[PDB]
Symmetry: C3
Subunit: 337 residues, 3 copies
Amino acid sequence: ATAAEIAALPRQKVELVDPPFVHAHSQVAEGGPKVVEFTMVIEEKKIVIDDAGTEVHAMAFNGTVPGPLMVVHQDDYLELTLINPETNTLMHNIDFHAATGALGGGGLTEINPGEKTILRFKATKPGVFVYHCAPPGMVPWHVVSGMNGAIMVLPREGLHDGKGKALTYDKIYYVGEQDFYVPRDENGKYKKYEAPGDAYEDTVKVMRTLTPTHVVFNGAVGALTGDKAMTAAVGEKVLIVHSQANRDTRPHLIGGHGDYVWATGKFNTPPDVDQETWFIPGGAAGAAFYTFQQPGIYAYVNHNLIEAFELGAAAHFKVTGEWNDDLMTSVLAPSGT
Amino acid sequence: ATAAEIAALPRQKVELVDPPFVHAHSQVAEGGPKVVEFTMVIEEKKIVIDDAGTEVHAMAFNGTVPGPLMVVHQDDYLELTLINPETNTLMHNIDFHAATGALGGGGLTEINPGEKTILRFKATKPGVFVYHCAPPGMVPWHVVSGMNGAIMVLPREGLHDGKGKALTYDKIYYVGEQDFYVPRDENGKYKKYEAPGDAYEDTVKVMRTLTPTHVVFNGAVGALTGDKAMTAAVGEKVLIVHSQANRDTRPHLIGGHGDYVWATGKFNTPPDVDQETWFIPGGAAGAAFYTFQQPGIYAYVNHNLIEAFELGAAAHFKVTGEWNDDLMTSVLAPSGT
Amino acid sequence: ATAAEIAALPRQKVELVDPPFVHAHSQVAEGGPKVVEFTMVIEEKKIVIDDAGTEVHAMAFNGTVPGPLMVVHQDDYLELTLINPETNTLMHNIDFHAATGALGGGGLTEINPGEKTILRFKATKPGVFVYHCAPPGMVPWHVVSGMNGAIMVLPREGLHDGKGKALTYDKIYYVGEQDFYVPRDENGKYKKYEAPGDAYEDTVKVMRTLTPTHVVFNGAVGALTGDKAMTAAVGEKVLIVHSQANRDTRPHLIGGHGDYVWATGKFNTPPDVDQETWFIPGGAAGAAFYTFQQPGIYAYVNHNLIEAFELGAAAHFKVTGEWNDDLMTSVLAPSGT
Ligand SMILES: [Cu+2]
Ligand SMILES: [Cu+2]
Ligand SMILES: [Cu+2]
Ligand SMILES: [Cu+2]
Ligand SMILES: [Cu+2]
Ligand SMILES: [Cu+2]
């Protein structure tokens, strides 16, 4: 499109929504290409990540770990205002894996405390994609401090299966998975630090072991379990976007499947089908579409079950509706022999 | 199908055999849906997993690690009678990744020692699938004590390539790969215990390192080597099902290929072809079809070669037949320069 | 077919070049099947892998880590003369994942110092494939000492996308990724040894932790940076072949994508498209095709960002040409809030 064309496109501001929920959007694009505008303030803040009071100095886009899902359509532009307040201690930036050029945007968005920047890019490829902070020389420390999220660039005609038939979800959830590396003293007690930088050398030591101390969804052990379970009903179609900016994961819905899974995250790559456990490499997002058929509790886990049930990578779904005895039935309930 | 329709279907009782062998079955289904009946008794027992006498308190479906492969066809019902004898010490259950509802069956099959249960589920999706025990609060401990196996839900038509041409094996094997986490004392010797619960806390400590002490096929170092090799002949078509319920693996046939690999394990996802090394994420099963072209010894490994050749994840195939010098030949045998 | 027929085929003697470059070849085969001849001399040699001066006794095909890329076309024959000079200490051999029979060639090419051998195999499957040394009882030690490389078996008609459209690259690089396991003294400084075998025991104890101390491209931290950065231009089509003979990797071009990615490395498996981060399991090679659209610096990394930026797995590209503000622009450069 020529210059004048780009400048005349509609601009639209969107209010973000914290994970695992997602801001207002339409599956099939509304109108032609537009510039979708978002604002995020970076917050450096201590968070508690487990039920032992373990602390991390999180580096949080929009104040959450993960950062929020932004949704646009292919060939829209994403225009982000990124703000680094003067109460923060570090420079930050942003790298969108959906974008082309300048290290994903990281070369154009280095903001010290007290600065802001506005980056625009054309979302030329459809898929879910990671975004993360990447300051030169300190890239993994920011990412493993929680400074990452995802976007979704929907096809203009919405999602389709591998034969081109529409796939239209009723609900979407975004599960960001975070590996944390929390230092411990010689008694095995997690350490606490006054300011983010005080932890840098001890944290890189743990990072070099390649073994996280915690692997969590939505920023903390248990953040999406119990009273915080996600919800659905029998018959509803749910899209589950999952990202992991630094380390591999292998999602699984305990009691369900991924009926269609873009395991690479990219919508022009046909989805796998009927999956039990899919694989999302570190540095990527994936998305799974499932129609719920049975009510009750499900878990949603990274299926290294030690990561899920010892280190924190487990969520719940609570599903309403009527039980299907064709699909499963207890012929003889547990009883004495 | 209605409850009465299911009650009228034919029943077939299968006798399971121990991995890496597979029970008798037909690739193409005979006739219409059936209720395929299986029984497994759970055995808690010490197993020795290496040549140094290292022990695991195994929790073994049908007394083996992995548990046996169960074979059905799409839209059959799998009816399992699961028995937990009074000689065991723990509650157990079963979660079938092929099933829909109640945590794969785990919510309906919780059996204390001295109980049994009967679960039926409809095998609605074709593929190879993990099953495993998953008692609330104790899930990865049971799995990494060997309490896992797989099933195969064949298409009613049998297997096909990505162009719907039939693929018919002459032979099938089931390789269950197991990560074990064995505690060591201050001198580096593996510890022994006299009841499963006595090893729990020390085991969990090793599990949280994410670093197995052993990675084995069929429950031990060397289980599928030497005179317990898998066997085949030149011209024979072989399907190798491989599962890993907790940790990723990357199978490779040394000297061969995966001609067709359903690396996700799901038969409605078209297979990869001409594979050197495929990838099966923790929590899944995959399957590889190969036609042997050369005789001699092959190795079948997890191609993290430290996991294969230091930790235990290596099997052999012995193949009969005539050498093909067109495919390969020693032009000059090793000799002085 | 027969010996008369194979004697009649043309021979082509190729001179290998050092990675990341690739010897001259034709993407579409010039004429009928040929016997493509290569020679490699194995060198046991001390190499320095980081700016601290850390050393590995490398075991290097052609003197480099990785070994060089050999390029043939499907149904050519690859005929390798492999020489183990008398100045080396160990027996070595070669196992081509591209080849069929005798453990990939391993069984036929065991040469002591002062010996040579010539192996010929038919390259029946198109793709990129790992090769590596594999002496029985010492397999992972040789591979993780750098004794591995890759070959490319091009379709005779050159590369195509999943739908039959030709994909012709303008240039090709070969990135070999190497996990090294270097012992450390009680100060945590890397140890040095006199001969390869002096480090064996201490190296095996690091290998069994499954945690490399360094993960590098082209044999050292920073090897593909600075005057050794890869290069391209806006509009240029680049194929990046990447291998890892022992351990998984997840390549990512920072600021770009993989437009077409044969993540399994096999050209009869249609490529994934629009990739952010692809996944190549240990024991495999993959290849990604990308048309550069923006000038400037890029990094090409294993996107476990601790592996990339702490352990060494980061290369650079320098790209010339004109910035595209439609793809990306800084609407407001970093500036005061
Ligand atoms: Cu940051
Ligand atoms: Cu990134
Ligand atoms: Cu159990
Ligand atoms: Cu499971
Ligand atoms: Cu060697
Ligand atoms: Cu190999």
